[PDB]
Write a protein that binds this ligand. Structure first.
Ligand SMILES: CC(C)(C)n1nc(Cc2cccc(O)c2)c2c(N)ncnc21
Ligand SMILES: C[C@]12CCC(=O)C[C@@H]1CC[C@@H]1[C@@H]2CC[C@]2(C)[C@@H](O)CC[C@@H]12
Length: 249
């Protein structure tokens, strides 16, 4: 209740494994290769999930693939933080059931700092007392939070679509909340949270980019679709062509 919420919960992707071999020692090459595999795998669900979103088919076919290729990073990270929260209380990064990052692994991955921000983000879900309804609505809104500076194929359908999801976030906050002060307060809290995701995804973008460039030397494997999206789409973000949409300055 209402119809919007039923869809989000029903289309919510299921558990996904990275197929990591926890029988081998934690090496940079191994860990990163598994993450990319998880990325490729998680990419398949994100696409199916996206197309199953209410009104997603209102966007031009090109912008549909576009928004996905630009925000797939923010979506996966945001979802991961939630899992980590609803699994190990944010104690560790729960990327996948067969790929959990502890203090040690965070270091071995050569991206300790970035993992800290992710864990921090994961702790936000708890401190702010985020609910499943709010989580689902915020995650969907992340798909519509990054586009090229010059706009999309048909920007009108996107603005209207993005606006409607923001409206849903209101009805969610409004519903079951008898107070006009905590309402705006809540919107402020969440909108702030959604913004914190962008800076994090930005560092992961640059990190994955560099890794790809020097992937053969550090012996890190990049799946087909991962290698193309990171070498064709990501570059547009790090070049200033595609920038995220912030609520606050
Ligand atoms: C190949 C497939 C279907 C998994 N796919 N689809 C898309 C997006 C898309 C494009 C056109 C029509 C669609 O239904 C979906 C995509 C992407 N952006 N990056 C990598 N793989 C993608
Ligand atoms: C999105 C993924 C994989 C899906 C997920 O649960 C979040 C996690 C965040 C770090 C990403 C990883 C995919 C592979 C990347 C992009 C590595 O190349 C460097 C950062 C990794």
């Amino acid at each position: 209740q209402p119809i919007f919420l039923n869809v989000l919960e029903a289309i919510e992707p299921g558990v996904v494994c990275a197929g990591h071999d926890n029988n081998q020692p934690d090496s940079f090459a191994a860990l990163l290769s598994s993450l990319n595999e998880l990325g490729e795998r998680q990419l398949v669900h994100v696409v199916k999930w996206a197309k199953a979103l209410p009104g997603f088919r209102n966007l031009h076919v090109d912008d549909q693939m576009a928004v996905i290729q630009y925000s797939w990073m923010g979506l996966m990270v945001f979802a991961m933080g939630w899992r980590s929260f609803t699994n190990v209380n944010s104690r560790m990064l729960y990327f996948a059931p067969d790929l959990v990052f502890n203090e040690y692994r965070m270091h071995k991955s050569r991206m300790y700092s970035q993992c800290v921000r992710m864990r921090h983000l994961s702790q936000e879900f708890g401190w702010l007392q985020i609910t499943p309804q709010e989580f689902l609505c915020m995650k969907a809104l992340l798909l519509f939070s990054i586009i090229p500076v010059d706009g999309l194929k048909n920007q009108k359908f996107f603005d209207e679509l993005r606006m409607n999801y923001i409206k849903e976030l209101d009805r969610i906050i409004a519903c079951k909340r008898k107070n006009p002060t905590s309402c705006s307060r809540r919107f402020y809290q969440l909108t702030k949270l959604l913004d914190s995701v962008q800076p994090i995804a930005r560092e992961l973008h640059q990190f994955t980019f560099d890794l790809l460039i020097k992937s053969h030397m550090v012996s890190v494997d990049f799946p087909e679709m991962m290698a193309e999206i990171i070498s064709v789409q990501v570059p547009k973000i790090l070049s200033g062509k595609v920038k995220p949409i912030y609520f606050h300055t």
